[PDB]
Amino acid sequence: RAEVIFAVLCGICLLLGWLGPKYGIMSEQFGFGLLLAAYFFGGYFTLREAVEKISKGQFQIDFLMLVAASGAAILGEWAEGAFLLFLFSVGHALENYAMGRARNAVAALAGLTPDEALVRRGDKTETVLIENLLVGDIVVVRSNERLPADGFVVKGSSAVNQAPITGESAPVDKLPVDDPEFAAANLDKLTPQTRVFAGSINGSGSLDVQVTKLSGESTLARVVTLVAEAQTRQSPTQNFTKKFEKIFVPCVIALAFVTSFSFLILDETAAQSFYRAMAVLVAASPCALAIATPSAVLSGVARAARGGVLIKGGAPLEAMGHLDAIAFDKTGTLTIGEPHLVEITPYGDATETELLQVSAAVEMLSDHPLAQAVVRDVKDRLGDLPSEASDFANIIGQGVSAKVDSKVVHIGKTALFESVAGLPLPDDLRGTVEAMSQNGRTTMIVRSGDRYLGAIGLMDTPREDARSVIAALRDLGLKRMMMISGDNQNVANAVAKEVGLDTAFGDLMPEDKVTKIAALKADGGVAMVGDGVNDAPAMANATVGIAMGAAGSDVALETADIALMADDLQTLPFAVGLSRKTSRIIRLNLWFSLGVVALLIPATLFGLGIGPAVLVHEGSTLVVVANALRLLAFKDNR
Ligand code: ALF
Ligand SMILES: [Mg+2]
């Protein structure tokens, strides 16, 4: 059941019922009865909407279009009524195709958090709903479960994925507090090995977590609420037309009906100037305008779709050109989304190949996500992989150990060599690793036996086309540029430098992104382009929200107004460009579609009929539609 077929039947009936009687061999009950159907199908839907708004609201333009059909029907030139009814039904169907907004992400957002939780009660562990969790409760989050509440760890250690909140799927090691009575009072002193969030996914170990916020006051409950209260962005052209009808419809139907009904000064029959007022009124129904505005929208959206970007409506399509600022998530948006091997720093008498081969020999046995990067990139650099190690063992939260060439190998964080039996870390290599950590490198130190072979550094590299699209967007007038990421500030600064963004903010929560976005939106229109769950509120409050189409979360795709479906950034200088020209195509098509009405309707009070109205109105409608179709031609300029 879809209502577009009534406009199609009015098209078939107008055309074939204009053809059957005239320049045709068809009877007047079959050939002209089609024109009878052309009044019924297109008129009956606009009629019921007219009734719906005339119950309470003041006026509707459908009154003007429908009575413009009806007066031509009860008078001469019924092709005028059928034509106006057909083209206005079609312009209504085109606005309905431009009006499609699913705007629902609550279904995906509700899945991030569980409904129930295990809570400790002395010698028992009860099951309660999360809305019945009290602050100070100890919930038991066991293996690979979704965390049900914000708080801090009091028992157990585990590697937790905080992707829905930090945007980083890189697991973070979590340890219990030293003193929980102290930790509940001093929430500002919670180290990131301790702060846990609802919606995170637990790792291998169970965690007792003391609750901090209530069920609705958690960070993820806040991002749900913030997304739900999004302002539905309205296109500047459409609300302009709403206010314009609010003035134009009653003004014209008052000034050109009863003031033109049976005017005493010029000779008229009391029954025949009754036709004279409706000539002006019926032709005053500005149908060129009702068809110009949605056709440009649909053409621009179709060109964007063949260009590889989804646009959910005309309002973001119009907003993309007017932007002054744009903000970028890092991981998955400006970066590829995976750590590569980017720095090798040998030490002492160790070669580069010894360091890389011992690293790949151990990381072939590990299952941490960095092991796979190390193995594939040592295989890239050396062409080969050495023989794998023996006696793999984990030092939990710090790294790994193995045995290569009858010597004991330790790899991991700087805290590992502070914790195990062998030779301690020299200060110079310590400082080198410190320098790598500050430069945004996740850093592993490698010892083989008595000797430190050295250190190695991995990083999520930016996309190759990032710096290019950044410079292009600066050329197109976007001098307000920033990075806003949940990753730490070293990686944010290093990627922002490597891409060419001047201001980079890391360590941000989703609300902090919303804060930065509102601060930019105060000075102009702003776009938030990202790919994660924690970017969805900043997308929702921005002037236009854009999601990375392929790698992105379903939450961010359902929330965003623009989708970069090729998952590449080179679609952004194209998009804004199209948006600018689209406004030109509607602006021209606005004034024309208005002007000719304002040009043909005073001319209708001074000697014009209903017969020529189709000829002017079609001449006003088709041409503007034709200009909108120029939007189907545009260039990439690669
Ligand atoms: F991927 Al992000 F902040 F969520 F850089
Ligand atoms: Mg992300």
Residue numbers in the entry: 41 to 678
Publication excerpt:
Transition metal transporting P-type (PIB) ATPase proteins are critical for cellular heavy-metal homeostasis, providing efflux of for example copper, zinc, and cobalt from the intracellular milieu. The PIB-ATPases belong to the P-type ATPase superfamily of integral membrane proteins, which exploit energy from ATP hydrolysis for transport of cargo across cellular membranes. Here, we present structures and complementary functional analyses of an archetypal PIB-4-ATPase, sCoaT from Sulfitobacter sp. NAS14-1. The sCoaT structures reveal that PIB-4-ATPases comprise soluble A-, P-, and N-domains, shown in yellow, blue, and red, respectively, as well as a transmembrane domain with eight helices: MA and MB, in cyan, and M1–M6, in grey, and that the PIB-4-topology lacks classical so-called heavy-metal-binding domain.
We determined structures of sCoaT in metal-free conditions supplemented with two different phosphate analogues, BeF3− and AlF4−, respectively, which previously have been exploited to stabilize E2 reaction intermediates of the transport cycle of PIB-ATPases. The structures were determined at 3.1 and 3.2 Å resolution, using molecular replacement (MR) as phasing method and SsZntA as search model, and the final models yielded R/Rfree of 24.4/26.8 and 21.8/25.5. (a) sCoaT E2-AlF4− (P21212, with one molecule per asymmetric unit). The classical view of P-type ATPases is that the E2P state is outward open and that the following transition state of dephosphorylation, E2.Pi, is occluded, and that these conformations can be stabilized using the phosphate analogues employed here for structure determination, BeF3− and AlF4−, respectively. Surprisingly however, analysis of the two obtained structures suggests that the anticipated significant domain reorientations are absent in sCoaT, and the models are in contrast rather similar. The compact assembly of the soluble domains and the position of the A-domain near the P-domain, placing the conserved TGE motif responsible for dephosphorylation towards the phosphorylation site, are typically associated with commencement of dephosphorylation, indicating that the two structures are trapped in an E2.Pi like transition state. Alignment of the E2-BeF3− and E2-AlF4− structures of sCoaT demonstrates that they are very similar (RMSD = 1.1), and comparison to the equivalent structures of SsZntA support the conclusion from (a–d) that both structures have been captured in occluded E2.Pi transition states. The E2-BeF3− and the E2-AlF4− (not shown) structures are occluded, lacking continuous connection between the ion-binding site to the outward environment. The rigid conformation observed for H657 in the E2-BeF3− structure is also observed in the E2-AlF4− structure. The M-domain is in general less well resolved than the soluble domains, and the domain is somewhat more well resolved in the E2-BeF3− structure than in E2-AlF4− structure.
